[PDB]
Amino acid sequence: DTTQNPQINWTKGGQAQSSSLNGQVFQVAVGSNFNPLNFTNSNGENIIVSAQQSKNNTTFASIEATSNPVNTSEAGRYYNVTLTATGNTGKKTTATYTVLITSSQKQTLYGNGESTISTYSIYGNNVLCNSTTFKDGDQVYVSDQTKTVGGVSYSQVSPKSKNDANSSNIWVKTS
Amino acid sequence: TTQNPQINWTKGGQAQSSSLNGQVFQVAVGSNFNPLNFTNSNGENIIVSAQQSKNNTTFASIEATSNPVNTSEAGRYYNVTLTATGNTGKKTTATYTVLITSSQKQTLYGNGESTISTYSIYGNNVLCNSTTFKDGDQVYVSDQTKTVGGVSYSQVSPKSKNDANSSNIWVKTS
Ligand SMILES: [Br-]
Ligand SMILES: [Br-]
Ligand SMILES: [Cl-]
Ligand SMILES: [Hg+2]
């Protein structure tokens, strides 16, 4: 009998998901900082796991990873993660998802309001409006080195590859 | 001949080393035409002057003794005769031909927007320019387009045809 058991919820990029966490398969990039209740996928979408007392009670329930062997150092490896949620009467629900380690971290660009995202080119210390624009939800490679000019931070990006992002001269304001 | 007035001209500010006599110019339908100072179809200012003689650069009086030019209809030509007079009363005349042409400018259509964005191109980078045009504006367009990221751009200038070749003001073609 399941109805009194904890319910495991998840959000992807802020949006509650209707599919069960159990049996999900995620991509995570080599070198990413992975926590089984809060991690970032290969495309840069934040995934957050949480739980409630039951299907009919949204009150917070405790949830923890009872098995998290995940290691992000090497691509082409997968790991299963098992979560267990426990309610106040001590009833349990577990969910198991699979994490695939992939090569590259992309980031998802959020206009946070606007449909359109402005880009810039930097020449010496002059920042010029570029004609290229991105749409909210576009996925790009981002160079690891930001640049600050007139007290504003900029990140160098490319839809092609990480290496291209290091010299693309297409910049967005850092979030 | 040497004691007679000499007729000079400039095009876009540069003194010309060809006689004004026998020149053929293009002038755009609808333009204001003055035979001593006018703007050709490509936007270059042409200015006529005269001097007392081959060796005396002192100003000499020059006027159109025959100017039937009418710019209202393209495909018509007119001859213009200029006569210069020196202070001893010696005369020189020059005759040039004016062709009335249709506009050598193109019209920019915003296809919706009142404003038309322009760009600057450096290598393969396209940057937003601050210059804007209004729908219906007329500009000179360079004959060489440039394509970047599969988008075609045309290089333009409101001033002259020649300026459009190096303005670094571009619009999206068509
Ligand atoms: Br994923
Ligand atoms: Br001409
Ligand atoms: Cl833009
Ligand atoms: Hg721009």
Numbering used by the authors:
A (entry chain C): 188 to 362
B (entry chain A): 189 to 362
Question: What is written in the article reporting this PDB entry?
Answer:
The middle domain of SlpX, SlpX_ac_II, exhibits a SlpA_I-like domain fold and an additional repeat of the SlpA motif. The four residues observed in the vicinity of phosphates are conserved with the proposed binding motif of YxY….KxxN. These residues are not conserved in the third SlpA-motif, which is present in SlpX_ac_II. However, SlpX_ac_II contains an additional 3rd SlpA motif and an additional loop region, allowing for increased protein flexibility to incorporate into the assembled SlpA-SlpX S-layer.
S-layer proteins (SLPs) are self-assembling, crystalline proteins coating the cell surfaces of many prokaryotes. We determined the atomic resolution structures of all functional domains (I-III from N- to C-termini) present in the three S-layer proteins SlpA_ac, SlpX_ac, and SlpA_amy. The Lactobacillus S-layers are anchored to the cell wall through interaction with teichoic acids (TA), either lipoteichoic acid (LTA) or wall teichoic acid (WTA).
